[PDB]
Each structure stands twice: as C-alpha cells, then as structure tokens.
Amino acid sequence: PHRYRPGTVALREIRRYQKSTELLIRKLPFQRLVREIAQDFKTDLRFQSSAVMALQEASEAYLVALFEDTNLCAIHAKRVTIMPKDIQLARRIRGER
Amino acid sequence: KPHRYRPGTVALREIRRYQKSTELLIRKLPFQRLVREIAQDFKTDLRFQSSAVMALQEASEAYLVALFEDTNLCAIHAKRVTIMPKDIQLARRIRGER
Amino acid sequence: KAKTRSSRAGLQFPVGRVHRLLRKGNYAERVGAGAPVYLAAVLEYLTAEILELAGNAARDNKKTRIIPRHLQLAVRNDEELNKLLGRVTIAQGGVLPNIQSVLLPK
Amino acid sequence: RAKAKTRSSRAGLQFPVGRVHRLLRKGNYAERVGAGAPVYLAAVLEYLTAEILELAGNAARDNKKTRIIPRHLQLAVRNDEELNKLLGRVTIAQGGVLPNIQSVLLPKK
Amino acid sequence: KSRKESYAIYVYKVLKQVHPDTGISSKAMSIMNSFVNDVFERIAGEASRLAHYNKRSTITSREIQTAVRLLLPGELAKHAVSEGTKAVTKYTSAK
Amino acid sequence: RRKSRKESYAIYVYKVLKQVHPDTGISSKAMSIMNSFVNDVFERIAGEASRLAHYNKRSTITSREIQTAVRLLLPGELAKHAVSEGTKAVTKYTSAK
Amino acid sequence: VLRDNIQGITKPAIRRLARRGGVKRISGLIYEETRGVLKVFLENVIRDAVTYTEHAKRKTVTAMDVVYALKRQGRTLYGFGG
Amino acid sequence: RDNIQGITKPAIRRLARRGGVKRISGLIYEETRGVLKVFLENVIRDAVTYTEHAKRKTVTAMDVVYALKRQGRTLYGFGG
DNA sequence: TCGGATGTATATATCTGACACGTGCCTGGAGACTAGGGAGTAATCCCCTTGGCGGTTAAAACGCGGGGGACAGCGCGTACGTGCGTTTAAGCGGTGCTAGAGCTGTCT
DNA sequence: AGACAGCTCTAGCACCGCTTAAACGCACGTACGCGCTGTCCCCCGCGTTTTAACCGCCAAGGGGATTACTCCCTAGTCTCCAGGCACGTGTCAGATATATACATCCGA
C-alpha cells in the first residue's frame, strides 16, 4: 500500500508536536520513575499530583531545549542524525557537566 | 635548507607556554582606551580606577579564553582543527548568550 | 475620605500590597514612599505588554481566552521579553513552531 | 569580670564567629539570626578555606614554590571535581587555565 | 492565615483595559501571577543590592529606577522608567 | 585625615594556612582571592539560608537553615564534610563552657 | 520496591520530545543516552526538592519544592504558584 | 574610533592559544572583537549604571565586580 | 510529470463545566501624627587620576612561501524510518483508606 | 516557633475492571553516516620593519572621602472602612465530535 518516505512523517510529527503543548511522556511511567529516584534520597516519600506534573513539565522542557541545542550542533557537524556525542557536547558547552 | 618548525609545532608549544603562564595577554593601553571609548557612549567624562580597568581585562580575557575552549570543543566536534566564526556563534548560542 | 494610592498614581496594581511585600521581603530596613509607586508602575507596564502580545496571539489564533500557549508565544516572539524570561519555563507553553531550513526537503 | 574568651575558640575555629554573626545581621538576610547560624557558617567557611588552601599548598609544593599564588589557587580549584563545580561560575584573577590539550591536537606523523 | 494573595483582579483589570473582549484561562492567570511575583522579586532583589552596595538603608525611586535599567532590556527599561517617573509625578503632584 | 579601617579575613586565611601548610606562604593577590572567596561563599550560603527561612515563613535563620543551604549549595562529599565540621563545631560549642 | 523504571520511558516518548525539539532523525544510541541525561537531571532536581521537603520536615513533596529546586538551578517554572 | 581594532591580532591569538586553539581562521579576529565589544558593553553599561546610582564620576573596581556578579560570573581578587 | 493518498487545518453544530459576574464581609489599605536618624547639604582636602614629555625597545604589523587542513565529491552499507499485526498497561472511571498537610491553640 | 494534643478532611496511595491507544517486535527499504579521495587556499612560521606600549618622572586639579550640621522623610502606632477575596451562579468558549477541504507529499 501507500508508504511515506523517510523523513516525511518526522517533519509532520515535528509540526504536530510543536503545534501541541501536551505532555509527551506517559504520566504513570514518569510518576514511577520520580518515585524510584526519590526513594534513593528518602523512602516512603509522597508526591503531590502537581509536584509530579511540575517535574514532568520541567523535564520535557529541559529535554526539548537540550534536543534543540543538540540539533544545532548536529547540523553544525553537517549531520541530520543526532548522536550521543552531540548531547555530550551540548551538555558540556552548556556547563552542566 | 634552513631549519623551520613544521606548521602547528610552535603552536603546540605556544599553548603550553600561555597555559603555563598567567599574565594578561591584551595590552593594557589598547584595552584601557577601548574601555573608555565604550564608556563614553553611556556617560561623558567618566573616570576609571586603575584596578577597574584591570578587573575588566581579567574578566574579558578569562571570558574569551573560556569561549575559545568551548569554541575549540565544537570545532573538534565538526572534525576540524581550525576554529571558524560559526563555531564561535554556535558556542555562544548553546551557552545561552543570544 | 480615603482614596487608594493606586488611583492617586493612576495605577491598577496594589501599591499597598507592593509596599507591604517590599517591607516584608527584607530588601532593606526602610522603604521609600516612591519605591512601591515606581515598582507598581513597572509591574503594571510589563503586565500590559505581556497581555497585549498574548491577546494579539489569541486573536491571531481566533481565540478569545488567553491560554499558556499564547503567553509562551508572546514571551518568545518578543525579542526583549524573551531575553528577560530566557531562564523561565512556562508550563503547557510548548515551543515556537520552528524547523531549520537544512531539515526541510530539498 | 569573667575571663574573656572568643566564640571561635569555644567552637575550635579560627574564623571570626562575631564577624560572621554581625555580617548576617547587617546583611539583613533575615529578621532574626540564630546563635547557631554563625557558628555553623564559620565552620563551613573555615573547612572550605582549609580545603582550598591544602590543595593550593600541595600544588605549590608540586610546583616547588614556597608561596601560594593565584595560579596555584586556580589549579587547585579546577583540578578538584567538586571545587570546580562549586566555583564553575567563578573567575580567578591571574589564575590562568589548566594545562589542557585535546588528543586530536597532539602531534602525529 | 489561610488567605491567598494573588494578582488575579489586577491582571484581569489590565486585560480589560488592553483587550476588553479577551479573557484569560485560570492556567494562564496562574502563570501571570507567578511572573509578576518573579519579576517583583528580581527588581526588589537588585534594589537590595544597590542599597547595600551604596550602604544606604532605604529603597527609593533611584534604586528601583536603577534596578529596572539593570534587569530590563533597553526599550523595556526606557518605557518602564517613563511609566515609573510619570506615575510618581502624578502621585506626588495629585497629593 | 586618616584612612578608615577595612576589615578582611586576611589573618584568618593565614592562620588556617599555618594549620594546613606551616611552611607555605601566600601572596597578597592570593590572599585577596581567598578573601573574595570567603565573602562570596558567605553571601551564597546566607542568600540560600534567607530563601529557606522565607519559604518556610520563618523569621530566624538557624543551624538547620545553614545546614540545608550547605547541602543544597555544596557538592556531595563537600556537603558531607562541611555538615560534619559544622555539626562538630556547633555541638562542641554548645557543650563547651 | 520500584526498580528499573527508567526503561518505562518508551522510545516513542523520547522520539516525541525530540520531534518537538525539531530533531528530524534520531540515532538508536540516543534513547539510552537521553535516559541517562534525564536520570541525572531528575536526580539533581529531586535531590534539591527532597532537600527542601526534608528541611520543612514534611513527608510529602510539595509543588513549591520542585519550583524552588528549578529556580535554584536557573530553570524557574511558571504556572505552579508564586 | 579605532580602539576596537587596537586589540592586536597577536593578543587575540594568545587568548586563543591559552584557550587551547591550535589553528585560527582569519575571520575569528573580527568575530572575536564583536563578541568582546558586546561583552564589554554589557559589563560597562552595568558598571556605569552602578556608578550613576552612586552619583559618582569614577568607575571603581567594586562597580565592575558588582556588574560581573550581576552578569552571572563572579571575579575573585579585587576585594569586596 | 502527476494524480491520488490522506494527514492536518478549518468549518459546522452541540455541548458543557469554566470563568466571568454577583455577593458577603472583614482585615488590610489609607489617613493622621509623631520621633528621629538616616540622608542631604556644605566646606574642605588631598590623592590619584588624567594628562604630558621623553625614549626605547618589545610587540605588532606587514610580506612572503607553501603545505596541510577545510571541504567537494564520491561509494556504500547499515542503520534508522515507516508499516503492519500484535498486545500490552496507561489512561479512565470507580472504590478505600487513612497518612499527614494544614490549622488552631497553647504556651512557653 | 515548636512541643504537644488534637481535628480535619484533603488527597495521595492502593486497587480492580474495562477500554484502546501507545507500545511493541518485526519487515524491509533506501537515506544518510562517514571513510576515502582530491585540492586549494589560507593560515602558520619567520625575516623584516616600525610603531606605539611601555617605563619613569612630574603636574595638577578635581572628586572622592572626610567632618560638620541639619531636618524631612519613614517606621510605629493608631483609626477606619470598603476592597478584595471564598462563596454562589450560570452561560457561552473552545473541547469534543463530526464532516470535509485542501495542501502536501508518493508511487507511478
């Protein structure tokens, strides 16, 4: 049947996910991850639904911003594919490493 | 044939020298006049403490040095040795200066 | 007759609250009477600029209610509010629609 | 009058507890400043001072020098993973930078 | 006390003056409330720096005007200073 | 006229230096940097201690506010050592005469 | 006991974030790289948030704890209180 | 005026060399001057602003330190 | 080329629970007055900053050769995108409980 | 502002059933990483030139720091009352559902 060529659905997805603000990570898996990490610092912690949302909003914004910076340095290397070294470079240039 | 160091061999030595030393690399007089030239655009007849011009030079040189490191990192990332203007702009953009 | 300091200054923002907050925020042991009036005027001005750009974005999007998307679009589109709020993340704001020319088809 | 002894000596500290206590009250960081705050803060400041001075003195001895200079302070701060993170946004005058060359820059055949 | 302090009324009134036909969502309203609180802390914070750097024990229009010029960009600063000086002018002259 | 006194931690940085390296000296430039560092760290810990007191609507900065500011500002091992030193100092200060 | 929940952040979820970020093509290596980055980011933000929670002697992580943590790290979040 | 061009090409090179750069394209100099010019403008404008608030006519080292402190980079070694 | 697939934006109608309006009321804003010391004003000084001359001599500028590294063009292969059927548990609604957030009062 | 006792009653955690979209494993193609090659330009290294940064010494004057004096401006306390803030309410905006245009891309 009809098939979209590579990159067509990616551009469409970029437009769709940029035109939309909803959270892209599943709420329940992220909530479990937050709890798993939080238990390392202090056990039996409880998280307000607003607190988990705050972490997800920040995490999605942080990663989206990081992917923007990563995309910029990927284009600089004359690549469209982002590589782990691109994330590592951006994080080092950003000063967070 | 006169003995000549191969391109970059003296640069590799210059890097060690300047990284080993800590003196300021911009001449005090050109920098001092540049500070007053820019300051004149904000307020006329300004005076600068001798140490104030030094503070601006220390920060300016440390900033450019730190910028060149980040610039070199992104130049190496592009599989290049020579740093180009787009490398500076990229480092400044990723650093959040624009 | 008692008339609010906000109306005297020609401002909507609560000069009394701004004065209260400055007095309670321990920014100094004393707060001059002109400080909250000046501060309230700046806060009201920034609020008007933000809402004006947000309302214009809402109208462009044929919406009549400002939602976080409009605030984000306004803040990031204005070359000076973006710089003021460069370190700010807006919940449910998303990002500016932008794809680099190199990524677009030939 | 009772024997006068400094608060720092009671805490086993060299740093001035009185100066830290006064600076906290004069800086208006809070409406009130508890007696434990300057003692705890002075201890942290003294420990961090010893931490940097020890690493700086080591760097000085490693450089065969008898006095710690800005260079030794910069090397001590940037060589320690945690001090480098604590002072990442800090620039030290006359300190220079760490001797650093990337492997791709080193000479080859 | 349980009382909640927010700029809901003031943001709405300014919105009515800027766009009487336009409303604002409770989510966008909470953002604006946090934005006002954040900018207020920045200007008040910088104003505290200026007072302390000049060992002054009070916050006046000069500290605010300077803090605004430091924190706000060029055009925002010029307009904010204009609005601030105008508001203080009317406030002082109106008695 | 006579020059006014300018207070600095010079004598304290030197006394601590004599403890870590009795034979090592310190130049005036390095002393100025150490004084700058002490004042910078002081303002940062005190600045975070203010935020903590304010967030909890407290009017008094206590050891708990300082300890929390230290844990937040200082990295992991530095925080542990600093907390231990601060705790030892405060405990010995309170128990001593 | 919660364990290995980092793998709960599906590859399509990372893809969507990258798509919102304008990423056109994502290397298969990015997925594990992104999880490690996010794991560090969340550890830093949660450590600070839990620190505020512990200082308040609370057992429930309040939304303000996350906002203050994000503020301290220079990534302040608007929309969850003042 | 020419004072922007007064920061000599070798001075830029020395900074780049201290920064670990091994090779420098001829266009880095003009770009570096612009980058420095905007950096100095942001720091001087704040220092001048701190000076004006003090009603002083000379920019002290503290005025530059506070300008940097606000600019987000702290400079050690000048007191205060 | 190119026409057909076929997702996203838009237009239509219904809906609905969100926010905009209406209300009660009390506590936080405004008004009045004081104390008082912080802040402004004035005179003074002096020092360090700005300005100038001399000169020399380190550093910068300029010219040149060439080689090495930036980058155009290329091949390819394997990794990643996309499509499909599978199936999985997140999302949704419902029910349970009681930890512990939030508050008051004491109170000390 | 916390030790202690107690109340509320919120809402976070605990749990099941059902839905079905999101996640998943796998098929499979050609888009795209990059290794390799060619090349030329433009950047390094040095001789050579020169200029202006640098040192050192002196002028001077002005503005910064200082002391002396003052008072008017703000914090504290008191008075007051209607502005703003939980509650009540409903209606109409854009979510949701449905239909259908059109722009954008693919197989021919």
XYZ file of C-alpha atoms in Angstrom, chain H:
80
model
C 37.333 55.333 16.937
C 39.929 52.613 16.280
C 40.307 51.298 19.853
C 38.320 48.163 18.955
C 40.991 47.418 16.318
C 43.555 48.338 18.995
C 43.251 44.854 20.494
C 46.016 43.394 18.327
C 45.721 40.191 16.320
C 48.538 38.517 18.338
C 46.664 39.400 21.538
C 43.616 37.545 20.206
C 45.880 34.653 19.172
C 47.453 34.472 22.640
C 43.969 34.272 24.165
C 43.022 31.551 21.673
C 46.282 29.712 22.396
C 45.619 29.916 26.136
C 42.151 28.574 25.259
C 43.763 25.546 23.613
C 43.087 26.546 19.999
C 45.684 25.065 17.643
C 44.671 26.836 14.399
C 42.688 30.046 13.868
C 40.838 31.093 10.723
C 41.455 34.674 9.581
C 37.803 35.560 10.275
C 37.979 34.717 14.009
C 39.617 38.080 14.775
C 36.765 40.285 13.536
C 34.247 37.905 15.139
C 36.167 37.887 18.443
C 36.268 41.697 18.535
C 32.495 41.869 18.069
C 31.947 39.238 20.773
C 34.243 41.164 23.126
C 32.629 44.507 22.227
C 29.161 43.262 23.206
C 30.612 41.608 26.330
C 32.326 44.849 27.385
C 29.202 46.893 26.604
C 27.073 44.706 28.887
C 29.627 44.872 31.722
C 30.492 48.568 31.271
C 26.833 49.619 30.975
C 26.076 47.912 34.289
C 29.232 49.309 35.910
C 28.320 52.772 34.599
C 24.782 52.203 35.883
C 26.091 51.223 39.324
C 28.323 54.314 39.202
C 25.460 56.642 38.219
C 23.326 55.281 41.066
C 26.169 56.222 43.425
C 26.235 59.688 41.774
C 29.971 59.123 41.279
C 32.041 60.112 38.250
C 34.689 57.363 38.500
C 34.040 53.661 37.928
C 35.591 51.747 40.823
C 36.706 48.122 40.795
C 33.732 47.256 43.008
C 31.399 48.705 40.362
C 32.949 46.286 37.862
C 32.826 43.383 40.334
C 29.128 44.011 41.001
C 28.488 44.324 37.260
C 30.078 40.904 36.734
C 28.346 39.464 39.817
C 25.056 40.517 38.202
C 26.170 39.446 34.706
C 26.377 35.940 36.224
C 30.161 35.489 36.502
C 31.978 36.226 39.756
C 35.507 37.668 39.687
C 37.827 36.937 42.625
C 40.840 39.038 43.592
C 39.546 42.631 43.628
C 38.061 42.771 47.137
C 34.509 43.004 48.403
